Amino acid sequence: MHAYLHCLSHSPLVGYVDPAQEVLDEVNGVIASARERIAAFSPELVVLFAPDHYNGFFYDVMPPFCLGVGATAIGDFGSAAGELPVPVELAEACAHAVMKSGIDLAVSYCMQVDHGFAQPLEFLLGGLDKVPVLPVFINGVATPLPGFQRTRMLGEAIGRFTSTLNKRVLFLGSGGLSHQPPVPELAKADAHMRDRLLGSGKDLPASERELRQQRVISAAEKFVEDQRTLHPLNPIWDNQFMTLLEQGRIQELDAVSNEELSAIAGKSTHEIKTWVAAFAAISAFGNWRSEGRYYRPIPEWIAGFGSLSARTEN
Amino acid sequence: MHAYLHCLSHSPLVGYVDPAQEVLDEVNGVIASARERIAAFSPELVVLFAPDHYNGFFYDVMPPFCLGVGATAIGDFGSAAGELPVPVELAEACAHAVMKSGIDLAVSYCMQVDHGFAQPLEFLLGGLDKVPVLPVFINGVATPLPGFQRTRMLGEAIGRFTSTLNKRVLFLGSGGLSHQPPVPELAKADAHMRDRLLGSGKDLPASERELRQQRVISAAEKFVEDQRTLHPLNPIWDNQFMTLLEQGRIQELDAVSNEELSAIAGKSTHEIKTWVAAFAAISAFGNWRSEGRYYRPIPEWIAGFGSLSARTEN
Amino acid sequence: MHAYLHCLSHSPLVGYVDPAQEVLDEVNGVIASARERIAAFSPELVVLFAPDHYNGFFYDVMPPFCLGVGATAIGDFGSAAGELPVPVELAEACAHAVMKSGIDLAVSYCMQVDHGFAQPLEFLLGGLDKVPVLPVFINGVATPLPGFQRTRMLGEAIGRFTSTLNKRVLFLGSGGLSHQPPVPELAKADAHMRDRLLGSGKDLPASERELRQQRVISAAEKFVEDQRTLHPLNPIWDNQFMTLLEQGRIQELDAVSNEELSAIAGKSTHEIKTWVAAFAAISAFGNWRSEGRYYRPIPEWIAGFGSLSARTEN
Amino acid sequence: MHAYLHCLSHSPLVGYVDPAQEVLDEVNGVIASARERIAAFSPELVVLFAPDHYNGFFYDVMPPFCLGVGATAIGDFGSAAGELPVPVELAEACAHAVMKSGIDLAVSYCMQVDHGFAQPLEFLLGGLDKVPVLPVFINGVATPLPGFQRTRMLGEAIGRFTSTLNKRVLFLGSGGLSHQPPVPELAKADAHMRDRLLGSGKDLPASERELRQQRVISAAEKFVEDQRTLHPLNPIWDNQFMTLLEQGRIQELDAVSNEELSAIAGKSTHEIKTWVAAFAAISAFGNWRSEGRYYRPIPEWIAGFGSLSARTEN
Amino acid sequence: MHAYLHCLSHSPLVGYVDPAQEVLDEVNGVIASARERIAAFSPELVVLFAPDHYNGFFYDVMPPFCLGVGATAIGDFGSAAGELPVPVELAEACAHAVMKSGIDLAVSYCMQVDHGFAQPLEFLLGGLDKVPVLPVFINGVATPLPGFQRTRMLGEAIGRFTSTLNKRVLFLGSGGLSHQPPVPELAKADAHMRDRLLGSGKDLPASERELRQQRVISAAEKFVEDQRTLHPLNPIWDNQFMTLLEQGRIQELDAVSNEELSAIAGKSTHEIKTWVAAFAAISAFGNWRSEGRYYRPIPEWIAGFGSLSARTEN
Amino acid sequence: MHAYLHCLSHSPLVGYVDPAQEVLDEVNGVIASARERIAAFSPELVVLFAPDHYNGFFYDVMPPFCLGVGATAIGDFGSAAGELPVPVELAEACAHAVMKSGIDLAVSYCMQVDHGFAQPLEFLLGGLDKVPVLPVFINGVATPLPGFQRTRMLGEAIGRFTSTLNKRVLFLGSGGLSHQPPVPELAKADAHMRDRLLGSGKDLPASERELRQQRVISAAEKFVEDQRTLHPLNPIWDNQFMTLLEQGRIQELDAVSNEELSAIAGKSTHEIKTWVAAFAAISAFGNWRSEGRYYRPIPEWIAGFGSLSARTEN
């Protein structure tokens, strides 16, 4: 059995607000190197964990985990749009096995996904339709939120299921590190914002999407001006987190509460739960080891960019 | 601490197809007696487990468990319609505590409910708005389905949470016993039926609702003609199940697989999972004992009608 | 101690309905290669697990496991007919030891067997009378059925018994993978079909045998036309099953219920229980390893053909 | 829950060879007293363990345990003949549950039974058709034989299953104590005797039945002449066995091997395994206590007559 | 051995901002009743847990727990001022034993205390110098903060130590329930505010004290105007907490993180840790039971007033 | 991960009272060799455990452990004076993690330190500002005192925290071995000495500092005259202690009570607790080994000079 893992922050701000071009070159070089490593691995199946940003899931129903038997990228932020090559029958078998294993997993047959699902596929495989995909959505914005413990459990379940497919599997994690975009809050939402959150946000007009993009860009530029306008980045905790992952010590993450993490690093950090899931999955394939570790704070994009890869040693 | 529990089959066929009027009188007498016992108990908070019949939850997102912070009865089958008195803040606290306890529970702020939520409230409390409610939906129709183990876990979580509210609590279970209405299947669904299941079933026209009601009535009359046209009722398993509940031996239900139960009693039986949840909850209040046990097969209504109650011994 | 194991689907449809001749050549090549490997091993004793198809066991008495002290092939489907070289005294000792070990095993002194016992012997050893045999029948058609747990237990018992014979042992598994021939059902059987199932099926006239063969052939051709006329094949589950066997993880099969498997793959799949027994047996000889894995779905023969071998590493 | 148990030796020699008439009166008085106690209990369901004497089960297939979904008494020795009121659906559910529990239990839809099943019903209920019955056959003549351990396990399984029927249950044990009738042996059987044992013994002519009856009568009279012509009775072991049962210490019977018992008391003693099963069953109903203990050796009938009863203390 | 426990919110706003006078009367009645119960108990030693409000402990050194061998009330808010009758030698022995038991406890020989230590003594004993005292300070304002686990451990240590003094002991808890006064924050503190926090706050001029009092009064009046200007009160969590204490289930409080509590109820809630300590202490005296439970939210005083008492049953 | 450890006695008497100059040369050679080894290691972060001598901590508050977020050396005994390069944010994260781990740790933002913190930095790194520092103060003079058990626990907590910083870490221990300077005692302190101990000792005039220095020098010369004027040195226990450390057997130090050690070696020995902490820390980095062991009693300086180093084996 063989397995390859890669986790990568996603940049909604690509071509909108940009840092010194040299840094951009370094980032692109890292991306290309990872892409080449994967192409060398030549995967057959792609498992993709990713969060959403109020595009398909809304407060009409908000599950902690969802699995997309049918998915479609809506092409936000100029990202790719269209359907995704999901192996329906395999997906249904996976859902059945996971839920039997003791995880409470919603399913969906027409899922709407955004750049959070698009960018990793484009950057790492050069298109949406290259390889069969198993999109898995993890809530990371709307409280209450799943804890680290359950996320690890979910990762292990999917890992043990896929370990018996006799294929070469690639796991992706698409959550950025500590950062804070200007995300609306339901508690302080007005009537219209509440209505958008409740389920009318599937059909946002292009004007509203552009307005939200401008909000994100302006907040990012303000964060460039000062890190205290929002939660300043925490390089210390980022390095802590990645190092904990590398040493294979995810057990120790159970001790952290959700709002512990919210207080330390800011509420948008919960995206990183995707990473945890990914790593848990690979631990079901026997021993392994990491590589390609890279990190860099970026004032221009609120995010602290990071990337990591791991590979099973057969 | 004090707690009262009651489980009762729901009859969508009330006034459409009817048995010998004497049986109807006996049923109504049982209902009235239970109602009087509850009124004697004088509850302060009502926790209500119930299934759906493709009215608010559709294959756009289908969670195994959902909790309704905001709910509204749509008045199907001539049942009551309108909003429900949900204690918002209490509901949010409950959701937080449950999910922290290790259960993966979706939430919703605008839930659509049908007779499955209406009839028990009307019959046992004389109206929707009498007491604060905590509506909890459990999937029982669309595979994959939660197992008995997880349902018991959910019940225990809610039970331990509510045990510390220092109130008098009433638990309701609204799932009928073994039966089979003519429920559409997504696997064999046509394009239009699939579209209705995917999420367009929230806005079914009155013509479609009447057509579905006529389908149910006709299938019920056919089942009256013969029990082999569909799955014949299994009185043996019904009595087995109730007796297992009475003796407080729900642990032994873990050994049963979902499609074990489907094969033995027919796929519609999964509704009874609500009952399990209810009983698990009351076990968190200390010792207790049952009463009011009653059961009777009914050819006219596909269901095998049943009812049960239990009470904590302080 | 030395042991060799081989499992192979049996094709009642050989020369009746046939696929593209190239596929036939590939199949025969695989068979010949396995035969040569066995001939290299040069066994002294053959333990043979196989199912029946209503030929000697009938509802007069239907045991879950039976051991044939005396056996005779009746030459169905043009397969070989005649007696089998059973080492009587060794067989009786085996039965005694197995039953002492805690398995409830019927015995028989005049067993009637069909192609399910003939084809593997002919194809792998070139005749019925080449080597001493221990025929063991496992029920796989008439409910209730033994579970995976007990089948594994039986395999282990026979394995530990034979491990002390100081011989070179060959284990055979003769159950096909997921498929569905047109098997009669006692529940829906008419008076005559019920009478045939009850015990009068030992003396089926050649006309009835030919009629049943024609039923099988016609149903196979219909299944060629469409896989939904009956249960479509499940390549996913087949590969799952074989991979689980190869990694030596049969323990995880205990979690599957009989009608779990029936729902996933179709009721005829229960034949594969033979395979499980075989593998369990070899695990009693110390460490081992697999080889020769091969699989291919075949529309023409309802079966999904498969084959596997394993060998102890002394 | 309520349960009553009774075990009683069966006398094939009633009216053929008789002891002093006073002893006969005492025996009949004991029988009548037990009958009255049962009639006071007023059972709803009867579970009946009994052995056979080469009348329906023959070496074509010989299971250790069998359960009769359909049964018929053939009226041997002038005993009653006709069908038995078996609750088919309940029987099938019982078989399913037992086999799931981990016991390997054959089933049969047309079972032939003899006086061993008739006499207890006539003597204790006054007819075959008074109450629903669950006939369970236990092998006690043809080696290899089930051990005490497995018999206890079977009893417990049936007990826990029936405990949830919410009925009043009566358990019967119909095996005599230590004795030895002239039973043919397959090992020393001639060609004709072997053929009769193999399966042609279902249709024994009345001449052969009368010959076998005369053999039994003559051997009984010889045993009257001397207890050393066959195995002499062992009153010590009989009292040992009953006392062990009364104190609820059946666990200690596991240490006894089958041929330990054969050597101590004679090979026909294995019938008493029925008793063990019965007692195990009642232990699943909570605490209980015994009564009516009675024993007496009888030279005239080879058997050492015994009888015992027990009752749950609610 | 005998022990009495009482916990009571402290009101810095007494006579500054006042609610409806009837509520004031009810509060005073509760206080008087508790006082009478204590006077009936007639204690010999008083253990007093209380927080501070930047009056003696400052960021020059900020311990999690401190024990005052010598203490002095500075008479803030018009509360009493002067020394406290501390049994020096007993105090030193207590410190030694506690630290030996495994708790890391600072000590101080000249401690400055404020109304948080004064009001309970005046209200419950009618003066500072009535009974010997053991003042114990618990940090509840300056992060990082001790968790519930360690606080319980501290309580148990003191409890077991005092249990062997052969005296009648009274435990006091002086932390208010959920509320939020306008407390300065070091992170956002200016140069002067930081200097005051660092240790120059021991000698605050009367002008600064009056300014801080006016800040508290104005913030309280604003909170009267709206509960969202600061964190609104959480009656649900208050009742949760008290009920958990009453049932003797403080173990379950370990699962709560500090900033869990901060998020749910507001950062000032940490005062209630005193209560936990108190209860833990009494658990070292054998069984006990509660009484006098009382609670009431008050808009006028930001606090949600509460009071509770418990007593050992000898 | 990589870690280097070094422990070294501190000599307040440098240039005041001196031994034979050859011994001085040997000491300086050892110091230089250790310095070169460290410079080869090239550390990035320095964790420094050290005691105080009544310079910043006084009986106003005396914690067992304190962590200095902000520190300043006051230049006693002619040692260096000025600020220290403390990585504020890293320090706060460390404090949070340690206290969460279950250690009760005070914090301070303006800490005053003396030669006990200065000399090791100057001698081993050539200045105060070379590397980031984490000053940690351990009480070793004022009873009650922390035990060995808790000190080891503290060391382990800091070790596991720093192990995930992905840096190269240097641990320092700055406590001398068995000795006794003329330290004032609070119990026998007069009014003025008590006032100095209570907190007025932060602002000791240069005259008082010179007087205390002269007291130390005179007591040292008297100890040169005779070792019985104070507690004579215990070379046996010193070698015992170092050997126990080298073999990695610090667990066995838990059995020693504080005043056990006080009786054996004299009350000033408690300084060595720093060493214990250091070693515990390094044990969190995996295996390691010691070197550079050196010891020598010195009559002239009351101390028994010692030095030790250890290094992780990657």
Short mmCIF file of N, CA, C and O in Angstrom, two decimals, chain E residues 212-274:
data_model
loop_
_atom_site.label_atom_id
_atom_site.label_comp_id
_atom_site.label_asym_id
_atom_site.label_seq_id
_atom_site.Cartn_x
_atom_site.Cartn_y
_atom_site.Cartn_z
N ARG E 212 -12.26 55.17 39.99
CA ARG E 212 -12.56 53.78 39.66
C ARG E 212 -13.96 53.40 40.13
O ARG E 212 -14.68 52.69 39.42
N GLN E 213 -14.36 53.88 41.30
CA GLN E 213 -15.71 53.64 41.78
C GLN E 213 -16.74 54.25 40.84
O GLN E 213 -17.77 53.63 40.54
N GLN E 214 -16.48 55.46 40.35
CA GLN E 214 -17.39 56.09 39.41
C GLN E 214 -17.44 55.33 38.09
O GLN E 214 -18.50 55.22 37.48
N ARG E 215 -16.30 54.81 37.65
CA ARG E 215 -16.29 53.98 36.45
C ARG E 215 -17.18 52.77 36.64
O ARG E 215 -17.98 52.43 35.76
N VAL E 216 -17.06 52.11 37.79
CA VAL E 216 -17.88 50.92 38.06
C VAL E 216 -19.36 51.29 38.08
O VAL E 216 -20.19 50.59 37.50
N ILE E 217 -19.70 52.40 38.75
CA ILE E 217 -21.10 52.80 38.86
C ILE E 217 -21.67 53.13 37.49
O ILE E 217 -22.79 52.72 37.14
N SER E 218 -20.93 53.89 36.68
CA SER E 218 -21.41 54.27 35.36
C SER E 218 -21.56 53.05 34.46
O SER E 218 -22.55 52.93 33.72
N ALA E 219 -20.59 52.13 34.49
CA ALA E 219 -20.71 50.92 33.69
C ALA E 219 -21.89 50.08 34.15
O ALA E 219 -22.58 49.47 33.32
N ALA E 220 -22.15 50.04 35.46
CA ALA E 220 -23.31 49.32 35.96
C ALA E 220 -24.60 49.92 35.44
O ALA E 220 -25.51 49.20 35.03
N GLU E 221 -24.70 51.25 35.46
CA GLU E 221 -25.91 51.90 34.96
C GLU E 221 -26.09 51.66 33.46
O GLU E 221 -27.21 51.43 32.99
N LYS E 222 -24.99 51.69 32.71
CA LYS E 222 -25.06 51.36 31.29
C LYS E 222 -25.54 49.93 31.08
O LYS E 222 -26.34 49.65 30.19
N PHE E 223 -25.04 49.00 31.91
CA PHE E 223 -25.48 47.61 31.82
C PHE E 223 -26.96 47.48 32.16
O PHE E 223 -27.66 46.63 31.60
N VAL E 224 -27.44 48.32 33.08
CA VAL E 224 -28.88 48.40 33.32
C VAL E 224 -29.59 48.80 32.04
O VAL E 224 -30.64 48.24 31.69
N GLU E 225 -29.04 49.79 31.33
CA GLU E 225 -29.66 50.23 30.08
C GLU E 225 -29.72 49.11 29.06
O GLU E 225 -30.74 48.92 28.39
N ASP E 226 -28.64 48.34 28.93
CA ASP E 226 -28.61 47.22 27.99
C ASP E 226 -27.59 46.19 28.46
O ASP E 226 -26.51 46.56 28.92
N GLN E 227 -27.95 44.92 28.33
CA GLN E 227 -27.03 43.84 28.68
C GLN E 227 -26.04 43.52 27.57
O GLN E 227 -25.14 42.71 27.79
N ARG E 228 -26.19 44.12 26.39
CA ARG E 228 -25.28 43.85 25.29
C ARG E 228 -24.11 44.82 25.22
O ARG E 228 -23.14 44.55 24.50
N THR E 229 -24.19 45.95 25.94
CA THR E 229 -23.03 46.83 26.03
C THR E 229 -21.83 46.08 26.58
O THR E 229 -20.68 46.36 26.20
N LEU E 230 -22.07 45.13 27.48
CA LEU E 230 -21.08 44.19 27.96
C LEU E 230 -21.65 42.79 27.75
O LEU E 230 -22.62 42.64 26.99
N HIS E 231 -21.07 41.78 28.35
CA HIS E 231 -21.62 40.44 28.20
C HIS E 231 -22.93 40.32 28.95
O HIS E 231 -22.96 40.52 30.17
N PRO E 232 -24.03 40.00 28.29
CA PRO E 232 -25.30 39.82 29.01
C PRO E 232 -25.21 38.66 29.98
O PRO E 232 -24.46 37.71 29.78
N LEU E 233 -25.99 38.75 31.05
CA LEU E 233 -25.98 37.70 32.06
C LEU E 233 -26.50 36.40 31.47
O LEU E 233 -27.29 36.39 30.52
N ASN E 234 -26.06 35.29 32.05
CA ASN E 234 -26.40 33.96 31.59
C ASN E 234 -27.05 33.21 32.74
O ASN E 234 -26.39 32.44 33.45
N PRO E 235 -28.34 33.42 32.95
CA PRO E 235 -29.03 32.69 34.03
C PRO E 235 -28.93 31.20 33.86
O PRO E 235 -28.82 30.47 34.85
N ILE E 236 -28.95 30.74 32.62
CA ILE E 236 -28.89 29.31 32.35
C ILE E 236 -27.62 28.72 32.94
O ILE E 236 -27.65 27.72 33.66
N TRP E 237 -26.49 29.36 32.67
CA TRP E 237 -25.24 28.79 33.15
C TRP E 237 -25.13 28.92 34.66
O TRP E 237 -24.55 28.05 35.31
N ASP E 238 -25.67 29.99 35.23
CA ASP E 238 -25.63 30.12 36.68
C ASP E 238 -26.36 28.97 37.34
O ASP E 238 -25.85 28.34 38.27
N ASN E 239 -27.58 28.70 36.88
CA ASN E 239 -28.34 27.61 37.48
C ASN E 239 -27.66 26.29 37.24
O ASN E 239 -27.61 25.42 38.12
N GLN E 240 -27.10 26.11 36.04
CA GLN E 240 -26.28 24.94 35.77
C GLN E 240 -25.21 24.75 36.83
O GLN E 240 -25.07 23.67 37.39
N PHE E 241 -24.47 25.81 37.10
CA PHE E 241 -23.33 25.73 37.99
C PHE E 241 -23.77 25.38 39.40
O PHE E 241 -23.24 24.46 40.03
N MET E 242 -24.76 26.10 39.91
CA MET E 242 -25.21 25.83 41.27
C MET E 242 -25.76 24.43 41.40
O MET E 242 -25.50 23.74 42.38
N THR E 243 -26.53 23.98 40.41
CA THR E 243 -27.08 22.64 40.49
C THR E 243 -25.98 21.60 40.46
O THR E 243 -26.05 20.60 41.17
N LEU E 244 -24.95 21.83 39.66
CA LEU E 244 -23.83 20.90 39.66
C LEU E 244 -23.18 20.84 41.03
O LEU E 244 -22.80 19.76 41.50
N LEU E 245 -23.03 21.99 41.68
CA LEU E 245 -22.45 21.99 43.01
C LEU E 245 -23.32 21.22 43.99
O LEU E 245 -22.82 20.41 44.77
N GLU E 246 -24.63 21.46 43.95
CA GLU E 246 -25.52 20.86 44.94
C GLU E 246 -25.47 19.34 44.88
O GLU E 246 -25.42 18.68 45.91
N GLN E 247 -25.47 18.78 43.68
CA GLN E 247 -25.46 17.34 43.55
C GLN E 247 -24.11 16.73 43.86
O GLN E 247 -23.97 15.51 43.74
N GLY E 248 -23.13 17.52 44.26
CA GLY E 248 -21.82 16.97 44.53
C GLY E 248 -21.16 16.38 43.31
O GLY E 248 -20.61 15.27 43.38
N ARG E 249 -21.20 17.08 42.19
CA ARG E 249 -20.60 16.57 40.97
C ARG E 249 -19.55 17.52 40.42
O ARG E 249 -19.52 17.78 39.22
N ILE E 250 -18.69 18.04 41.29
CA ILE E 250 -17.68 18.99 40.84
C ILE E 250 -16.67 18.36 39.91
O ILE E 250 -15.99 19.09 39.18
N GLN E 251 -16.54 17.04 39.91
CA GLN E 251 -15.62 16.38 38.99
C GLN E 251 -15.89 16.80 37.56
O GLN E 251 -14.96 17.03 36.79
N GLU E 252 -17.15 16.93 37.20
CA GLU E 252 -17.48 17.26 35.82
C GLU E 252 -17.09 18.67 35.44
O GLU E 252 -17.17 19.01 34.27
N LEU E 253 -16.68 19.49 36.40
CA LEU E 253 -16.25 20.82 36.03
C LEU E 253 -14.85 20.83 35.45
O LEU E 253 -14.45 21.83 34.85
N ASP E 254 -14.09 19.75 35.62
CA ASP E 254 -12.74 19.72 35.09
C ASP E 254 -12.72 19.87 33.58
O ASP E 254 -11.75 20.37 33.02
N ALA E 255 -13.78 19.44 32.92
CA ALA E 255 -13.79 19.46 31.47
C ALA E 255 -13.87 20.87 30.90
O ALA E 255 -13.69 21.03 29.69
N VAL E 256 -14.12 21.87 31.71
CA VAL E 256 -14.31 23.23 31.21
C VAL E 256 -12.98 23.96 31.23
O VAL E 256 -12.28 23.95 32.24
N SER E 257 -12.63 24.57 30.11
CA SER E 257 -11.42 25.37 30.04
C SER E 257 -11.72 26.78 30.50
O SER E 257 -12.86 27.23 30.52
N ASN E 258 -10.66 27.50 30.86
CA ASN E 258 -10.84 28.85 31.39
C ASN E 258 -11.54 29.75 30.39
O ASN E 258 -12.46 30.49 30.74
N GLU E 259 -11.11 29.69 29.14
CA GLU E 259 -11.69 30.58 28.15
C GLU E 259 -12.93 29.99 27.51
O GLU E 259 -13.73 30.72 26.92
N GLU E 260 -13.17 28.70 27.71
CA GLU E 260 -14.54 28.22 27.56
C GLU E 260 -15.48 29.02 28.43
O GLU E 260 -16.48 29.57 27.94
N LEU E 261 -15.17 29.10 29.71
CA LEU E 261 -16.01 29.83 30.64
C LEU E 261 -16.03 31.30 30.29
O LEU E 261 -17.07 31.96 30.39
N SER E 262 -14.89 31.84 29.87
CA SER E 262 -14.85 33.24 29.50
C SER E 262 -15.79 33.52 28.34
O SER E 262 -16.50 34.53 28.34
N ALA E 263 -15.80 32.64 27.34
CA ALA E 263 -16.68 32.85 26.20
C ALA E 263 -18.14 32.71 26.59
O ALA E 263 -18.98 33.51 26.18
N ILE E 264 -18.46 31.69 27.38
CA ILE E 264 -19.86 31.45 27.71
C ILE E 264 -20.42 32.57 28.58
O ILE E 264 -21.49 33.11 28.30
N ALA E 265 -19.71 32.93 29.64
CA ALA E 265 -20.29 33.78 30.66
C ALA E 265 -19.60 35.12 30.83
O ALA E 265 -20.09 35.96 31.59
N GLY E 266 -18.49 35.37 30.16
CA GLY E 266 -17.82 36.63 30.38
C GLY E 266 -16.64 36.47 31.32
O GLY E 266 -16.66 35.66 32.25
N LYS E 267 -15.60 37.26 31.09
CA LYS E 267 -14.33 37.01 31.74
C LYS E 267 -14.37 37.23 33.24
O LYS E 267 -13.57 36.64 33.96
N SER E 268 -15.28 38.06 33.74
CA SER E 268 -15.31 38.28 35.17
C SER E 268 -15.84 37.09 35.94
O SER E 268 -15.76 37.08 37.17
N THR E 269 -16.38 36.09 35.26
CA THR E 269 -16.98 34.96 35.94
C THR E 269 -15.97 34.15 36.75
O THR E 269 -16.37 33.43 37.66
N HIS E 270 -14.68 34.31 36.48
CA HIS E 270 -13.70 33.43 37.08
C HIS E 270 -13.70 33.52 38.60
O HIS E 270 -13.21 32.62 39.28
N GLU E 271 -14.29 34.59 39.14
CA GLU E 271 -14.42 34.68 40.58
C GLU E 271 -15.04 33.43 41.17
O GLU E 271 -14.59 32.98 42.23
N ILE E 272 -16.02 32.83 40.50
CA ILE E 272 -16.70 31.68 41.07
C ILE E 272 -15.76 30.55 41.41
O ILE E 272 -16.18 29.60 42.08
N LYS E 273 -14.51 30.59 40.96
CA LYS E 273 -13.61 29.53 41.36
C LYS E 273 -13.53 29.41 42.86
O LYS E 273 -13.41 28.30 43.37
N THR E 274 -13.65 30.53 43.58
CA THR E 274 -13.66 30.44 45.04
C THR E 274 -14.69 29.43 45.50
O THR E 274 -14.37 28.53 46.29
#
